[PDB]
Amino acid sequence: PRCSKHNRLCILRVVGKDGENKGRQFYACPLPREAQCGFFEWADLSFPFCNHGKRSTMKTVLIGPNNGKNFFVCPLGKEKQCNFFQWA
Ligand SMILES: [Zn+2]
Ligand SMILES: [Zn+2]
């Protein structure tokens, strides 16, 4: 997706704050903090559900052929993560 003011591909940011949505990913304007439009669109509205019944979180590969691809995992923290995995 792209913001509306600028027709530019959004970045995927993570809500780094406190509340019932810390860690939830959202598409936002890709420009520097200045000139950045106020675009904001929750990214996980179409993500798969992990085995807990919760919206999965998207990760990227950080060297081989499948470098750069996206996948989905349980969003709860290694200690309590379920075993859900799915390629995007
Ligand atoms: Zn923008
Ligand atoms: Zn889970």
From Swiss-Prot:
A zinc finger (GRF-type) spans 3-46, 50-88. Expressed in keratinocytes and embryonic fibroblasts (at protein level). Also detected in thymus, testis and fetal lung primary fibroblasts. Zn(2+) 2 binds at residues 50, 52, 74, 82. It is found in: Nucleus; Chromosome. Zn(2+) 1 binds at residues 3, 6, 29, 37. Belongs to the FPG family. DNA glycosylase which prefers single-stranded DNA (ssDNA), or partially ssDNA structures such as bubble and fork structures, to double-stranded DNA (dsDNA). Mediates interstrand cross-link repair in response to replication stress: acts by mediating DNA glycosylase activity, cleaving one of the two N-glycosyl bonds comprising the interstrand cross-link, which avoids the formation of a double-strand break but generates an abasic site that is bypassed by translesion synthesis polymerases. The N-terminal region (2-281) contains the glycosylase and lyase activities. The RanBP2-type zinc-finger, also named NZF zinc finger, recognizes and binds ubiquitinated CMG helicase complex. The GRF-type zinc-fingers recognize single-stranded DNA (ssDNA), possibly on the lagging strand template. This is Endonuclease 8-like 3. It comes from Homo sapiens (Human). The lineage of its organism: Eukaryota, Metazoa, Chordata, Craniata, Vertebrata. The chain holds residues 505 to 593 of 605 of the full protein.
